[PDB]
Amino acid sequence: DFGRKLRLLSGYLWPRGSPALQLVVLICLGLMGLERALNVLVPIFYRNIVNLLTEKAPWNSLAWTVTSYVFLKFLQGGGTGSTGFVSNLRTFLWIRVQQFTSRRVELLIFSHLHELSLRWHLGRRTGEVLRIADRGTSSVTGLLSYLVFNVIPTLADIIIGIIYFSMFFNAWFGLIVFLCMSLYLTLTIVVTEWRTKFRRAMNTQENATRARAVDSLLNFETVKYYNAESYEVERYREAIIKYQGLEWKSSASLVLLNQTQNLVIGLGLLAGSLLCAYFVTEQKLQVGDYVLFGTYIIQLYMPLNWFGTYYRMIQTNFIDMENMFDLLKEETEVKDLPGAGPLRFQKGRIEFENVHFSYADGRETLQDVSFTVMPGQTLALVGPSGAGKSTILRLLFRFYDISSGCIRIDGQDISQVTQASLRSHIGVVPQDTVLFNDTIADNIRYGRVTAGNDEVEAAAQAAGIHDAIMAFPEGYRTQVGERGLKLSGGEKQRVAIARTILKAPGIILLDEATSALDTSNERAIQASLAKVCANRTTIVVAHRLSTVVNADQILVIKDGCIVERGRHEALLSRGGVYADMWQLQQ
Amino acid sequence: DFGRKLRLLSGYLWPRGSPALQLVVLICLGLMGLERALNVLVPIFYRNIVNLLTEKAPWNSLAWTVTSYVFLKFLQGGGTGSTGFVSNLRTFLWIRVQQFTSRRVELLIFSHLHELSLRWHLGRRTGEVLRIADRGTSSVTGLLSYLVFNVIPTLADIIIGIIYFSMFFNAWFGLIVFLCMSLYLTLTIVVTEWRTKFRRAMNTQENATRARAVDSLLNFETVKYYNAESYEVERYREAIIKYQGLEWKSSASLVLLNQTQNLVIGLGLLAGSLLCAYFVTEQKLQVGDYVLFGTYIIQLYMPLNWFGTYYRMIQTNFIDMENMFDLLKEETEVKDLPGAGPLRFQKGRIEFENVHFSYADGRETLQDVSFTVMPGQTLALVGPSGAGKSTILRLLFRFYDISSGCIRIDGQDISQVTQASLRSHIGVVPQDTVLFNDTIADNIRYGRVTAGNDEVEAAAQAAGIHDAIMAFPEGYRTQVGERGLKLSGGEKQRVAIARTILKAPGIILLDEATSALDTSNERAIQASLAKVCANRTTIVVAHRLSTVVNADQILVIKDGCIVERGRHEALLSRGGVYADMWQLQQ
């Protein structure tokens, strides 16, 4: 698992497109190498300074060596390595590089999320699916940073120090450093797993307590069904105590981890210092070697202080990146595109042949359904409240797929046509239109982006909404939606009419809204529909009399099956739609 | 401002109630003092070790001094001071202390939020008001910790080092350390303000980008009104680029701050080291004084690496704590309790005298309204859809206050009575009842907590819901609400009936629900209401004929004013409620 995940990380490391960023990557790697070299060099110069000082050297050489050592200590981090001029140049350049990868990953995720089929988006919520994506991009960035620039450099420092001590200092100090660092790493990992178990146990109860508090605040019914303020306080207190117990366990585990790491490094330092002092007394080592060993041990210790955290974060980011990859691979485009060739929209003839469709498991909704609309002619659909009418509207728009049957537009099966042209050629008015947070002019032009402002104004005039736009103070810069002011029913229905005018479609998949409003504005809206649906193939879905009376072919659906066919007056005489119209609306 | 805020923090420091925690506080302060002492002591022992080593001392004294120095370096932090045995004992004991303060503050806030009047809760949302409280408790805890244990210790270390160098080392090193630290602090603050401006500028755009992504994901209408996937992708990319430019500016400012701090410490180290080396060559100082100065300068530097962060966090937590205090002081209990004395509920006679009430600004809803209900008699309220009926129901329950007039229960004005007994004696059935996430048995006993399980089962039987509880698999342990399964209308109406049976009230402020359901279950529910409202004063609010026909005194409200008074048949003959009943429901 480690090998494959490292392979994916390495694949994401190199910027594929720009050449100006690979140079920056190489410079950053070179700076990392230079930091390792400085890590080795500085204690050596400290030893040289002490050795020169102990033998009464003249002022000139001492001054120049002191200046050089101070300069090296400035280049290296004055503390914890995250401080020097080097590695800060590195943070700068890696800012510039990591920005590119973050943008690319975010755009790839956002461009994949917009092509999955509808059933996928009706299934899962939006908050969870966006949390996974955000956490995935943060995971890839943090994994690259953490590993490459904080974990491998330290494991290289340990090995380099082992080599230097074992070859250029003595033989036993190699054993000392090796044993100390091995024990440190082993104990850190072993304690860290245990502490992770405790941390998860605490986090669950924290979330539960927050939920309880939110629930007690939202329902101000505590006053009604009792004087139960005290009870809601007491349950909150009990939950708080439970959470506090778990938190105490977790943080005591943290303190234990810190103490064991400190004890290991202290034992190593004690052994090394005692051996070095004994050797110095026996004229085998010089006075500077003592401070060399002390400084180098502290220098090794400082990065090691943050390895439990790195272990935790590496594991978490690995599982997160696996989640993000497994939704990137989820190629559920079930209503995909086999073949190509744009639909030839001559006039707008729609056909049906005993189509079979079933999206709800077990039961089947649409069976043996076939009808036809002449170009320009208007068809209506009436029946009991359910899904069949909206379902067939969705089927015509190529959202789901037909299990068995045939469905054509102008003698052309839409199963073999590209989705883009199909969806471009067909207009529609939904149940309730939604205006995203932007200006009114932008919402109008959203029907066709390339169009200019004059078309926007002309269509707003054509839809009878332009005066109400002038009623707003700012006008065409007015903030709309949740951020801006709220809109009444006629306003949003008219803006939908405006944008569907902009789109200039051939078929209007009208779906009349059931929103309650004054009859005058309602009849104005229906008139606007009448002059926008003129000379265009139309399919109307409504529970009202207005669509029924003037339509050309009324259809009735019972459990997703055609029971009555024909015209308004024949259905009236049959004793069918007559009873439904008299009972439903009266 | 600083003095006042420090006074409040100091007031919160000392645990007022338990004695076992003040001992822990004193021990923690003593440990802080011991850490300062070790901070002074360790470099002195390092100098002693070097001095003994350079003069060829025998092995015994060297061994014991080395062991003592290693022990002191173990007690003191092996790195960055957050590592030693001391201050880790302190973190342990302060865990135990800080849990107490966190609990007390959280419970104070939660007990104050449940006593504010209704208008306050209808005004503000719940997420914002809970965010302020959570951030306030975190702010007080973090302020105490940050200041007391991380800011004053460092400013004490700087002064102690200045004194030690200026008195026991030489005169010029005092100047060196003083100038270095003064420049460090000044530059840190000056750069930090600039950087926080940049940080806020970046955070706003980050939030905007997240909102844009959320909006584009929620509205899967992009496919509908265009093939506008590309347009949404491009807008997302532009927003990303804007956020990225702001992020680059902020983090470059961070790098500049790091570099200026490092340069200041490097200049100080260079000056000190050069002067110390020159003095050593001139036989004025010993060899160990050099390593003393170097170690002590590094030791001073290490805590100082995190002062921009502490400045930012101190400012943000101060403003957050002020927000929390200013909502703790918001004593807006406008429907307060002047006087005391529980209401004497003899039988349940309700009176009214031309009450004047107006909660909506400008217009007034209730004016010149007066009626009376005999004990046991049922009164109904009918009229156009609005607020007057629910408004008067709220007024009877002492939610708002009467601007002018009189309202009595059993010849006793409720303005002079305590709210607890009033709300205890009056039951209520709301528009839609809500079941918080818990078991069914708990939701039933929520009407009266002290009651046992047998009463719960008896009332569930009396309300005709007990069999449906047995239908659930777990039964009385079934999870209900958002966490658990969903419930139908009759189920929640019956659980409301059950809990109001448990409460055993005298007046039933019935408010019939408008939820659509089958007529059989509806009439069963109405029958249950009839046998639960028997022998109890009742006020019924509904749009249905069932309450109207059998009531004892029908009242009609027009713009919050009584227009028709009397019985069902008189109102029928008047030509009033007759037209309304025939038009509204038919």
Add this chain to the structure above:
Amino acid sequence: XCECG
């Protein structure tokens, strides 16, 4: 080490 988690 932070608590970062």
Add this chain to the structure above:
Amino acid sequence: XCECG
């Protein structure tokens, strides 16, 4: 000295 904040 993240970043926190």
